[PDB]
Design a protein around this nucleic acid. Structure first.
Length: 125
DNA sequence: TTGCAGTGCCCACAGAGGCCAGCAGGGGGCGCTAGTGAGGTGGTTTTTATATGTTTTGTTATGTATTGTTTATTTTCCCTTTAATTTTAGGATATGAAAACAAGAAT
């Protein structure tokens, strides 16, 4: 529930950034799954990415499936819904990306693992 | 004149072939109808589309609460100066205790 944790009043953004760093050092797959799930539920898609469906089958059919499994109740998406709670949601989202990527610049960002999948999925979407 | 060898004629029943009704062969043209097949029109609904009313969303303005700012009255740390207050002899007191005297008592 990293989408909800980042959204619903995160006390310290660097704290959950370090939590994601610790989970990635523990196991790359689960932290990558959590980051992808965070991005998908940040896109307004209420579908949840699973371990095998992230690991095995590719990103374009993931995009097609989440287009089929968007599960909307309205046409609005979290980038345009009214204001306050969602405005601070968007700010926390941007700051989480910035702090998470910038904090790993010393040793983690040269493992050549997360950026391939992240770039592929984000480019496809 | 006759017997014999050969001819004439008349009939008749077969023999034959045209005449004729009967009958079957292939094909042309009409009287009439059941049964679909398709095409056109009308009705129905229906579905898209359009417009109106209500409500939801976004924007604006006012009031309250929070943070900051130079005063500003504590307040408090640090002097130099007294006002109790304490300590050390120095003399006087007192209350005791021997010491001498005087008074019973004994020898």
């Amino acid at each position: 529930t990293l989408f909800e944790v980042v959204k619903l009043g995160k006390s310290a953004m660097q704290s959950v950034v370090d939590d994601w760093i610790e989970s990635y050092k523990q196991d790359r797959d689960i932290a990558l799954l959590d980051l992808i799930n965070f991005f998908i539920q940040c896109s307004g898609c209420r579908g949840t990415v699973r371990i095998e469906m992230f690991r095995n089958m590719q990103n374009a059919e993931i995009i097609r499936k989440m287009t089929e499994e968007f599960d909307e109740d309205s046409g609005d998406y979290p980038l345009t819904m009214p204001g306050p709670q969602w405005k601070k949601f968007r700010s926390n989202f941007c700051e989480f990306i910035g702090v998470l990527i910038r904090q790993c610049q010393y040793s983690i960002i040269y493992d050549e693992y997360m950026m391939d999948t992240v770039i592929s999925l984000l480019t496809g979407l």
